């Protein structure tokens, strides 16, 4: 890698970048590319998992919290539960009763409730000083090797590229994690590019790269308070304390007209691969929340937004508000048995992201649904 505190993506296992990277245009070179067989994708996926796992090693396990919780809703609303439980203190012969708020999605019923992963694995809390904000990562070639770049403006992903340049290394790629919509990536320069391994299959996803960004404004309106609970000898647990003010739902705002222009353009270019059929967009069909919603890390909180307000239309020859849920116990990269607890972040959260692309899947009139939780399709 090459790069340019304690960020989760900056473990410093890799060197600093060259301030003035070179690029050499190779005249008269035709090179056959195939983005679906590219092994830089597997390399990135593996490195991303390792940076994450290394970063979570040096911190507190929440094994001691797998106790029965007594959860009520006595003082929150007229999805968030007020739970009491017994914990040990730094002395092994002493216990105390404490209170914390938990989101309903992190707690399951069985002295009424249990944390969702206590019968599966140990939950590690995120190390509290570690930021999850993405840092561009450059991938650079070793001696004896070269990285070739395709400069064709209309290149979809496969076949000959008629403008090939040699680079010392790649542009910085931000390890942004998302599902249905691709955020903060690169834009197409001339038109929306629709690319897939096989545009006529149903088993393959379609990556749609936009040439214009659409802003999405997301927020977490509840003024959460962080509370620090001592679990052990130098081991602190970060709990949500009382909510100050109103209890409000997290949400994302997408302009109505920008989204509609984006779809008119996506459909126009989709009818270039499909015959002149009616095209319909539907919400995803079901399954785990990580698949059915648009997930992202905003300010360090993990959002799961409902996109049925976007993918609900029929195409033939104001502001959109998406409600969102927040979870503290998560299982990234579809790895079962390795949950992580995201400590609450004090204060209100707001972030503005750029939708730069979509991940669509064809159902068995053509039907398209958003989706694909396999991170390699983002990279």
């Amino acid at each position, epitope marked *: 890698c090459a790069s340019d505190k304690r960020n989760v993506w900056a473990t410093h296992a890799c060197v600093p970048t060259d301030p003035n990277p070179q690029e050499i245009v190779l005249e008269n070179v035709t090179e056959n590319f195939n983005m679906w067989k590219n092994n830089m994708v597997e390399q990135m996926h593996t490195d991303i998992i390792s940076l994450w796992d290394q970063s979570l090693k040096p911190c507190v396990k929440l094994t001691p919290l797998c106790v029965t919780l007594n959860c009520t809703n006595v003082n929150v609303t007229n999805e968030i539960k007020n739970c009491s439980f017994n914990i040990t203190t730094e002395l092994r012969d002493k216990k105390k009763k404490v209170y914390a708020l938990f989101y309903r999605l992190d707690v399951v019923p069985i002295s009424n409730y249990r944390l969702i992963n206590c019968n599966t694995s140990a939950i590690t809390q995120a190390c509290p000083k570690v930021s999850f904000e993405p840092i561009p990562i450059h991938y650079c070639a070793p001696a004896g090797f070269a990285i070739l770049k395709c400069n064709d403006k209309k290149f979809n992903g496969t076949g000959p590229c008629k403008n090939v340049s040699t680079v010392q290394c790649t542009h910085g790629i931000k390890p942004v994690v998302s599902t249905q919509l691709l955020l903060n990536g690169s834009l197409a320069e001339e038109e929306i590019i629709i690319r897939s391994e096989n545009i006529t299959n149903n088993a393959k996803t379609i990556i749609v790269q936009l040439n214009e960004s659409v802003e999405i404004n997301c927020t977490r*309106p509840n003024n959460n308070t962080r509370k620090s609970i001592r679990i052990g000898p130098g081991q602190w647990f970060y709990a949500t304390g009382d909510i*100050i003010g*109103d209890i*409000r739902q997290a*949400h994302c705002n997408i302009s109505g007209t920008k989204w509609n222009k984006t779809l008119q353009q996506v459909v126009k270019k989709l009818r270039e691969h499909f015959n002149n059929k009616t095209i319909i967009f539907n919400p995803s069909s079901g399954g785990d929340l990580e698949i059915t919603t648009h997930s992202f890390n905003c300010g360090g909180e993990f959002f799961y937004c409902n996109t049925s307000g976007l993918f609900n239309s029929t195409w033939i020859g104001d502001t959109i508000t998406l*409600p969102c849920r927040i979870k503290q116990i998560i299982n990234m990269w579809q790895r079962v048995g390795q949950p992580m607890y995201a400590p609450p972040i004090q204060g209100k959260i707001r972030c503005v992201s750029n939708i730069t692309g979509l991940l669509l899947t064809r159902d068995g009139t053509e039907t398209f649904r958003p989706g694909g939780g396999d991170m390699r399709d983002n990279w």
Partner: antibody, heavy 131, light 108 residues
Framework: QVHLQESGPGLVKPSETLSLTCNVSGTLVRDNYWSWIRQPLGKQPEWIGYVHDSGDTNYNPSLKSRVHLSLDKSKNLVSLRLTGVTAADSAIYYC??????????????????????????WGKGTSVTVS | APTFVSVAPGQTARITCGEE??????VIWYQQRPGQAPSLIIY??????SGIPDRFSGSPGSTFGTTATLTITSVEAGDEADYYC????????????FGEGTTLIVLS
């Protein structure tokens, strides 16, 4: 000017039905919300419930099974039927018009708001003793 | 149950109610002359109905952690009345009972 006049028996027996009537003048019953309020002597007033057309009626939970409120459109009267009266019901009762509005704190689409009620026009009331 | 304050005529009175605000609120204030039905002074924290002077105002419903407050400036002999306060709050259940009042005693 709306005028609300009130009457009742004055004296009601224990474990008996109390029926109070509010004579509405200057406005029609069908066009507003009505509330009943009572004030035990020496105490802060209690909101019994409120009644309106379109089924928009609700009651103080402690009186959920004791109070029936109704509106007589033809006689333009507002009334209260309280059953099973006890010593605790020995209060001055009032008839009042009610107005309402909405307090919005968040996204209206997510129903992050509530309806509040207030009483602008009050009658003189009637004193009821349960013996 | 009641609280008392004593203000010389021409002085400002301060009357408060309830518990701390949890969420957005809409406080409704009433004035009760002895022997009479109460009447409305303020609805929605600071919106007074016609007939009520600008001497009556109060705290906003936008804050949390505070109590309802009614401020009566230039108190007159005509303000010797009890004061009641009905609190609506976005996190608490509907309050069917007006809170305990504060009696304003006007001197001289």
């Amino acid at each position: 000017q709306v005028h609300l006049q009130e009457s009742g028996p004055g004296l009601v027996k224990p474990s008996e039905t109390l029926s109070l009537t509010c004579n509405v003048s200057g406005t029609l019953v069908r066009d507003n919300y009505w509330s009943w309020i009572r004030q035990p002597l020496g105490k802060q007033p209690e909101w019994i419930g409120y009644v309106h057309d379109s089924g928009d009626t609700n009651y103080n939970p402690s009186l959920k099974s004791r109070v029936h409120l109704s509106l007589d459109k033809s006689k333009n009267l507002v009334s209260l039927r309280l059953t099973g009266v006890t010593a605790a019901d020995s209060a001055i009762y009032y008839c009042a018009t009610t107005k309402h509005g909405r307090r919005i704190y968040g996204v209206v689409a997510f129903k992050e708001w509530f309806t509040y009620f207030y009483m602008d026009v009050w009658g003189k009331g009637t004193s009821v003793t349960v013996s | 149950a009641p609280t008392f304050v004593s203000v010389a005529p021409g002085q400002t009175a301060r009357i408060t109610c309830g518990e701390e605000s949890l969420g957005s609120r809409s406080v409704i204030w009433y004035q009760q002359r002895p022997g009479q039905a109460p009447s409305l002074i303020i609805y929605n924290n600071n919106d007074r109905p016609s007939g009520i002077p600008d001497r009556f105002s109060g705290s906003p419903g936008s804050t949390f952690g505070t109590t309802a407050t009614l401020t009566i400036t230039s108190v007159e002999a005509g303000d010797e009345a009890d004061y009641y306060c009905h609190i609506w709050d976005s996190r608490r259940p509907t309050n069917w009972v007006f809170g305990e009042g504060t009696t304003l005693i006007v001197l001289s």
